[PDB]
Design a protein around this nucleic acid. Structure first.
Lengths: 245, 466
RNA sequence: AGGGCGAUUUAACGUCCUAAGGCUGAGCUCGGCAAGGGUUAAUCUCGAUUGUUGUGUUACGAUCGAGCGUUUCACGUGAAAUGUAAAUAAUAGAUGUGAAG
DNA sequence: TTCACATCTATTAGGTT
DNA sequence: AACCT
């Protein structure tokens, strides 16, 4: 079973280098937040436009049902007369044209869905000023998996609203992006960044942390996708997720 | 102004007529449950799309204009003329416009007019779109759409877009809603109170069996019948015991006049022997609480709560959902209502004391601090509830509420004002080291709080703060 | 010992039902089964004048008396109201912390 | 994974066929 | 009792 281990990290270098690294990380997390919002909104529009109804189609189907019930009750009550005959002829031709309008509007909705699907939803080439390339790949995998579960929990029928995404969301990182080794233990990462684990003693914890890091540096266990985030105190918490098969 | 009165109700008809009306009520709650969520989804998607669509392009235009002005001003500074910082800002603004130009190119592709198609097809006709769920009474759409339209605007004003807070996720417990002029009160032959409610069966008001002890409800219902007390939008909700309760909401016009002495104020404190003692400012006092009731009922309440906690944790699952949910809901309601009742008791006594001797203003020790929660009997209490009720009943009678800092309140004389350590040498009495003043500790604290005039509003604006 | 039930919320009193701090159903999954009594009352003793439903049903009280215990005011005494006591703004979400597999 | 409490916002429809 | 706003 997969598990999560919470670690506190620090980065070394010149003070200006530290400022640049932290500004870069903050801006990248801001970009990831924006990307999640974009993707979720577009895919939600995609799923609304196809399965659910539309505005005027209901406004017309209600009139169709009204005319159908009117004709039914008139037929029931009927069993001088030319007025009623002309009345239900008018009603039946109105029903025919109403059916035509409903069919054409449904065709409009369906063709709009077909046209939008590949033009603006097959892959989102809409650009957020990402400072890395792979972060788009992680974003799409995260939205697509979320809506599948959320919709199956009743999001389509109206039992739960769409999942908003907040700033405090951790900065997603690929498993291969970060590498760790001892020189204390340093966290080699992309963009030429080598974090350093505090490993310092703590009253509640940070004693088994040494044991688990020594276990994982041995190569016994593989690293899965992890997350990186700030805290109420700036500490660059690494929400490392270690998985055991 | 507005106020709410709770009433229990019953249906008129045979044994089987109750089943139909109960099913009607349950289904009309379920439909509203679905409609609120759908409306929230649609409006959230629309308003995200607006800023995520062309609004991005106009934002980029504004950004580019401001940046070009910035480098233009930077160029002007360079001319006037250090030069190093100038070139630095230049390269910065350069890369800025660069990426910005990529953004502008990607936002000008014009592949679809998504905003307009969505705005016309769904959001401008959300009323009719909601009809996909079979509202048995079709007029409730207006209530749902009004509530949703107001709620999204308020939530957006709170900071929804920036990513601070999530989207609302209404739960199945949401009560049914009724219109204002949809409830008509009319006397019955048996002198009951009958309410006519559309699409089904009317409602009788259970109003006691003996009229000795329920004269207050009768007066309010009468004032409603003659229309003195305007009726506003109400709600219907079932208790855990399937008793229909109608949150009758009244908009009472407040026009009573109570003359008040100019400048006379009161003060409150939370001692270890009085739950809330108080006094005046300008030989007047009124103890409110009693230890021998509060500390003896809450003790057994929490004790039996912990007993059932031990029982459920000891049992393998506690027989699961049935017993778990029963115990959880029972204790939750019991403790929350007990706290609500006691907060009513304290606040009502305070305001009644204030109004009896024609007070004009109220001061009391600021709540919610790290202090004033300790050194008090109400060690774990819903302080915000009392905070709300005191302002409510004060404004209902034209009284203002202000808060003051709690520093040096326990160990400062209220006659001379000297500050020394140990001046409260006796727990049950106070003796001044300078003027020889002999008054009780609670009265000295109340006088101290009444005298003070250093009103504070936020936690950070305190003499001591961490 | 817990819970209904006494116009709603608390605590005590009054009366009923239980291991519903259970059992039984259908296709790993989802549901059903409890509660004043009967004309002297369902929350002080008794007195007078009065009723209402008609029977084990959605259709048991009013008014004067006393005694009995409460609260408040002046100098333990006297006055008022009380009828178990104290209350009667209530929903909905968001954000923050705890407990239990 | 799934339940509780404390602080803090805004609300409670009108007119017309 | 519904629609529109």
């Amino acid at each position: 079973m997969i598990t999560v281990r919470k670690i506190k990290l620090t980065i070394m270098g010149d003070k200006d280098t530290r400022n640049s690294q932290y500004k870069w990380i903050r801006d990248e997390q801001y970009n990831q937040y924006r990307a999640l919002n974009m993707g979720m909104t577009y895919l939600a529009v995609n799923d609304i436009l196809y399965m659910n109804e539309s505005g005027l189609e209901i406004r017309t189907i209600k009139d169709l049902k009204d005319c159908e019930k009117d004709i039914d009750k008139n037929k029931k009550e009927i069993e001088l007369v030319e007025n009623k005959i002309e009345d239900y002829k008018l009603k039946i031709v109105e029903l025919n044209k109403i059916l035509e309008e409903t069919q054409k509007e449904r065709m409009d909705i369906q063709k709009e869905f077909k046209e939008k699907y590949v033009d603006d939803l097959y892959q989102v080439l809409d650009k957020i000023p990402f400072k890395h390339l792979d972060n788009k790949s992680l974003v799409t995998q995260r939205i697509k998996a979320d809506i599948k579960s959320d919709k199956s929990n009743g999001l389509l029928k109206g039992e739960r609203s769409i999942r908003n995404y907040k700033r405090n969301f951790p900065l997603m990182t690929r498993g291969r992006d970060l590498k760790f080794k001892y020189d204390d233990i340093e966290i080699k990462w992309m963009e030429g960044i080598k974090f350093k684990v505090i490993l310092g003693n703590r009253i509640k914890n940070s004693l088994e942390l040494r044991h688990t890091l020594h276990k994982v540096i041995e190569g016994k266990y593989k690293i899965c996708d992890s997350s990186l985030q700030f805290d109420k105190n700036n500490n660059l918490i690494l929400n490392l997720t270690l998985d055991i098969p | 102004m507005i106020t709410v009165r709770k009433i229990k109700l019953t249906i008129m008809g045979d044994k089987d007529t109750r089943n139909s009306q109960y099913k009607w009520i349950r289904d009309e709650q379920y439909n509203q449950y679905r409609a609120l969520n759908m409306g929230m989804t649609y409006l959230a998607v629309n308003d995200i799309l607006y800023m995520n669509e062309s609004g991005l392009e106009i934002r980029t235009i504004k950004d580019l204009k401001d940046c070009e002005k910035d480098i233009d001003k930077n160029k002007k500074e360079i001319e006037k003329l250090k030069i190093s910082l100038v070139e630095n800002k230049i390269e910065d603004y350069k890369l800025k416009i660069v990426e910005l130009n990529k953004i502008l190119e990607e936002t000008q592709k014009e592949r679809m007019d998504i905003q307009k198609e969505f705005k016309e097809k769904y959001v401008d006709d959300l009323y009719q779109v909601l009809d996909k769920i079979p509202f048995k009474h079709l007029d409730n759409k207006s209530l749902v759409t009004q509530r949703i339209k107001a709620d999204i605007k308020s939530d957006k004003s709170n900071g929804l877009l920036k990513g601070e807070r999530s989207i609302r996720n209404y739960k199945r417990n949401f009560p049914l809603m009724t219109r204002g002029r949809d409830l008509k009160f009319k006397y019955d032959d048996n002198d009951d109170i009958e309410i006519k409610w559309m699409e089904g069966i009317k409602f009788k008001v259970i109003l006691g069996n003996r009229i000795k002890n329920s004269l207050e409800l009768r007066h309010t219902l009468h004032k409603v019948i003659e229309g003195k007390y305007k009726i506003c939008d109400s709600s219907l909700q079932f208790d855990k015991n399937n008793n229909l309760i109608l949150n009758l909401t009244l908009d009472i016009p407040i026009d009573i006049v109570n003359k008040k002495v100019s400048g006379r104020v009161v003060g409150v404190d939370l001692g270890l022997k009085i739950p809330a003692y108080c006094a005046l400012n300008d030989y007047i006092k009124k103890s409110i609480g009693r230890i021998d009731d509060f500390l003896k009922v809450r003790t057994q309440m929490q004790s039996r709560r912990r007993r059932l906690q031990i029982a459920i944790q000891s049992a393998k699952g506690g027989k699961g959902r049935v017993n778990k949910l029963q115990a959880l809901e029972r204790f939750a309601e019991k403790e929350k209502n007990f706290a609500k009742t006691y907060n009513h008791f304290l606040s009502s006594n305070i305001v009644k004391f204030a109004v009896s001797n024609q007070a004009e203003q109220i001061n009391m020790e600021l709540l919610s601090l790290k202090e004033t929660q300790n050194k008090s009997i109400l060690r774990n209490w819903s302080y915000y509830q009392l905070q709300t009720m005191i302002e409510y009943k004060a404004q209902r009678e034209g009284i203002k509420v202000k808060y003051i800092d709690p520093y040096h309140t326990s160990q400062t004389c209220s006659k001379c004002g000297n500050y020394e350590e140990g001046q409260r040498e006796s727990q049950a009495d106070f003796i001044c080291k300078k003027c020889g003043y002999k008054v009780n500790a609670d009265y000295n604290a109340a006088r101290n709080i009444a005298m003070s005039n250093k009103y504070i509003t936020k936690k950070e604006e305190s003499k001591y703060y961490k």
